[PDB]
């Protein structure tokens, strides 16, 4: 079917091709059919939609197509039905429990970037990975292929330092402190973060509260070269594009398969040119890694994988048993991160973790002598040096450097739980806490989340507030409250 | 968020809700977000697409939504973001290899029919089932829930007979013969069939060549009551509606998970009201069941499942080692089935299988004394009685009762493979044959397929025709030739 391109103003989150109903009938095209649209060299894969929105001889392409392609309005194109990708066969092999060849893995990823493989296929591959897993060879191959399928950042500074968390632990806004501290010491730390996957707020969600996080790689180079650091969303750019698509399936299913997770973090690091990388693994009940043996094993994977990519990797196994700091959800976490930086003061759990992580990086970067990195990190934070650096990052990223953290808006609707009985907190359930924060509307509603007044081992008297739920909407707040009652996230002995 | 309905002539194969960009920003709505559209009783779950096609305060819904939901233009509606469905947790529990409780299974089915769970979740569920499976309790729970989810056909005749094949074997147009034969005997047989899953052609695809296959339940009742039988597409009607949604993922991935398969076939039989059910299990190399012992196990599952539904189930374990008859793909298969009915003459593999299955049903039906059913079926075929019944079914289904089978168009692009050496055919690879036929464009191109000239144990001379490939498009033919050349489906010794 040959047609003239019309650009339709809609974003479905997929490549949408609008086909004339008469034209579609003539061409035997059905809704959600996979088609290829080509003119000369240029080609795109889209999902068919039938409508009268498009005139005869007219094909409509959604705005999504525009970003990675170059199709002009009225340009003549050929629309041809596209067959099931050969790569589905490879997805089926993984499903059966078979190890994938490098060439097979390469085929799947390119298919993902190409959009030949769609939600059903991608979800199937992710589910297969979750149930059947990957060995180190598959992961290394997956990581490299993911990285190779995108652009690579070029930064004139070296060496390039990086920090990443596998997350899971609630309220982990820690790296927001860490980057300004490392950059303040003069090291180069261009950080990329995903949005929430299994949690209430991903770091990008938190940063987005006070600054833009979506940039082009060119924009990223300029910011990092001028400021020495960035806190940006990995998704927004053509860095490991396969990863952005794969994460969406993971987010929907509330899963983060370890082999995929390793490939996802490391592929972005390789794309960014990171040489010295620090990985944080929250460990404990309610998180991705329950035990230290599990954490150590995971640490070895990160280290072996980095070695294969030519990267120096160090891992910190940290306590993930409870939420970090006092906040869950994007605005609340942002307020906590910003105030801690600006005043140099904040919750012990956040400050100690952040200084320790930054300290490892400072030593790795060679700016701190062995064993003095954590102390140096504290001085940088306390002196307001990290704050000055953060102001620069925020200004470079379209934020207001004069922002007042306590003035950042949080959810209008609130309900506070109080201690039923006098006692001491014996546990906080991380999974329950995340679920409640999500019920409140996080992270889509930045204001939504939980403020936590208690931590484990702390004595409490009856009527002492345990936590407050924040929500933009009353319906969301009520759902969170209902969930909170069933869950009993805070346990008092 | 409150909005007013605008019905748009768009069909995406999914429930897509168009949201104004300014409105989306206010409501924190992003592409592919799930939203619930509510009026009073009226409820629908849709996938958000941001567009400048609709004004502020307007939500655009595809006219598709109107089929099962009575929305009207300009109606005030509530648009609220839907949280991740609770059933996703159950899907996740399945990924972890856990046994699903009845409530968990019921919740998944409610969510599928509600369109609450979309392609990602459904694909994840099908994949998880494929890797981890279901036990009998779960399958029984799945079957009842799927049946209960939809309407029940009321036919004023009893007993109701049905036949179903698990398929897998290529060229299984066999039940096309069986239904007219059983009906000719005055028995009531309202057959439903799926389109292709793992095969080149589903029975529905084959029947569609000569007659309409999509009908309302009211239409099915009218045809079956008048004619006593039907050959229709199961997908088109609200019987076990969940099954139709899951099959799409199954078709895309080319998998038919066994527990899902049992629940799918049996739920439809139960919804239809079938009391006596004959299940055909093709057994052999290149098909879903490799061995007889495996077939007997699957047979036991079908029988026990039927007992739970209060149905009498009989199972025929047939030979699936090679393609039935001489054709693969929808038009070719139709020509072979219609010709066999019309002349009473056709390939031995098809006629013998069809009469044998029809015979079991005739005996079950009480129309034939024990052990005479196959003979009776052959008499019905040879006398033209089956053909007269088929002409009735066809007329009732909107087809031409007077069509000539020889005249049905088939793909005009052909290539014939010939014997490289002299010898005897020792094997035919079903998996290769289905793949080649699919490469040819089957079933989407009805003309596409394979005509098979040889069968196992047959002596061949170098240069004897082995099979011919049919395609409607040159490119499709060329890809098929390539596969066939690499594949070498026919083994000569
Ligand atoms: N597979 C992954 N890919 C990218 N980032 C991840 C991944 N897993 C965890 N993260 C980081 O941890 C947070 C998301 O994980 P979660 O806490 O499970 O939502 C984000 O801030 C990410 O930067
Ligand atoms: N799970 C299933 N649901 C419905 N029909 C099926 C199923 N499995 C096999 N069939 C029948 O077998 C054919 C499709 O399976 P396949 O042979 O794998 O394409 C159709 O003619 C169906 O009626």
Swiss-Prot record, chains A, B:
NCBIfam families: AMP_phos, ARCH_P_rylase, PRK04350.1
Presence of the UniProt keyword Transferase in the record: yes
Effect of residue 288 to A: Almost complete loss of activity
Quaternary structure, from the entry: Forms an exceptionally large macromolecular structure (>40-mers) in solution.
Factors inducing expression: Constitutively expressed (at protein level). Does not respond to the addition of nucleosides.
GO MF term (any one): pentosyltransferase activity
Comment text on domains: The N-terminal domain (residues 1-84), characteristic of archaeal AMPpases, is essential for enzymatic activity, participating in multimerization as well as domain closure of the active site upon substrate binding. Harbors two dimer interfaces within a single molecule: one by the central domain and the other by the C-terminal domain; these two interactions can continuously occur in a repetitive manner, leading to multimerization.
Enzyme class, UniProt record, top EC level: transferase
High-level lineage: Archaea, Methanobacteriati, Methanobacteriota, Thermococci, Thermococcales
Catalyzed chemical reaction(s): AMP + phosphate = alpha-D-ribose 1,5-bisphosphate + adenine; CMP + phosphate = cytosine + alpha-D-ribose 1,5-bisphosphate; UMP + phosphate = alpha-D-ribose 1,5-bisphosphate + uracil
Entry EC number(s): 2.4.2.57
Active-site feature positions: 256 (proton donor)
Cellular component GO terms held in the UniProt record: cytosol
Residues bound to AMP: 168, 194-199, 203, 264, 288
Pfam families in the record: Glycos_trans_3N, Glycos_transf_3, PYNP_C
Keywords: Allosteric enzyme, Glycosyltransferase, Transferase
Gene that encodes the chain: deoA
GO biological process per UniProt: AMP catabolic process; pyrimidine deoxyribonucleoside metabolic process; pyrimidine nucleobase metabolic process
Keyword Cell membrane: no
Activity control note: AMP phosphorolysis is allosterically regulated by the substrate AMP.
Name of the molecule in the record: AMP phosphorylase
């Amino acid at each position: 079917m040959k047609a003239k391109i019309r650009i339709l103003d809609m974003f479905s989150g997929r490549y949408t091709v609008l086909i004339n109903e008469e034209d579609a009938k003539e061409a035997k095209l059905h809704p959600d059919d996979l088609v290829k649209i080509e003119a000369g060299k240029k080609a795109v894969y889209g999902s068919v939609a039938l409508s009268n929105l498009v005139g005869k001889g007219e094909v409509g392409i959604s705005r999504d197509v525009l970003d990675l392609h170059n199709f002009s309005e009225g340009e003549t194109v050929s629309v041809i039905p596209a067959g099931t990708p050969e790569s589905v066969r490879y997805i089926k092999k993984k499903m059966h429990g078979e190890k994938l060849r490098k060439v097979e893995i390469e085929a799947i990823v390119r298919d993902i970037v190409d959009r030949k493989l769609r939600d059903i296929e991608i979800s199937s591959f992710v589910t297969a990975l979750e149930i059947n897993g990957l060995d180190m060879d598959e992961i290394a191959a997956l990581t490299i292929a993911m990285a190779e399928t995108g652009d690579m950042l070029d930064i004139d500074r070296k060496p390039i330092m990086d920090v990443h968390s596998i997350g899971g632990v609630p309220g982990n806004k820690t790296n927001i402190l860490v980057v300004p501290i490392v950059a303040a010491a003069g090291l180069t730390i261009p950080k990329t973060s995903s949005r929430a996957i299994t949690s209430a707020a991903g770091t990008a969600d938190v940063v987005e509260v006070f600054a833009d996080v979506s940039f082009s790689l060119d924009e990223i180079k300029r910011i990092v070269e001028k400021v020495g650091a960035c806190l940006v969303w990995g998704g927004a750019l053509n860095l490991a594009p396969a990863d952005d698509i794969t994460i969406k399936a993971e987010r929907a299913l509330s899963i983060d398969p370890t082999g995929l997770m390793l490939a996802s973090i490391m592929s972005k690091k390789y794309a960014m040119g990171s040489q010295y990388v620090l990985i944080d693994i929250p460990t404990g009940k309610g998180v991705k890694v329950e035990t230290v043996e599990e954490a150590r094993s995971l640490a070895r994977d990160f280290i072996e994988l980095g070695k294969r990519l030519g990267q120096y990797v160090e891992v910190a196994i940290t306590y993930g048993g409870q939420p970090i700091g006092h906040t869950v959800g994007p605005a609340l976490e942002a307020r906590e991160a910003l105030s801690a930086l600006m005043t140099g003061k904040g919750p012990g759990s956040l400050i100690e973790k952040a200084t320790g992580l930054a300290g490892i990086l400072l030593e790795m970067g060679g700016v701190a002598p062995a064993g003095t990195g954590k102390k140096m990190a504290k001085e940088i934070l306390e002196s307001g040096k990290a704050w000055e650096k953060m102001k620069e990052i925020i200004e470079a990223q379209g934020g207001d450097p004069n922002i007042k953290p306590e003035e950042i808006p949080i959810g209008d609707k609130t309900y506070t739980f109080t201690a039923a009985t006098s006692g001491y907190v014996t546990a906080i359930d991380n999974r329950a806490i995340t679920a409640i924060a999500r019920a409140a509307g996080a992270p889509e509603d930045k204001g939504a989340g939980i403020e936590l007044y208690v931590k484990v081992g702390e004595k409490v008297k009856e009527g002492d507030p345990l936590f407050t739920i924040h929500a933009e909407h009353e319906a969301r707040l009520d759902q969170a409250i209902v969930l909170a009652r069933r869950t009993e996230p805070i346990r008092i002995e």
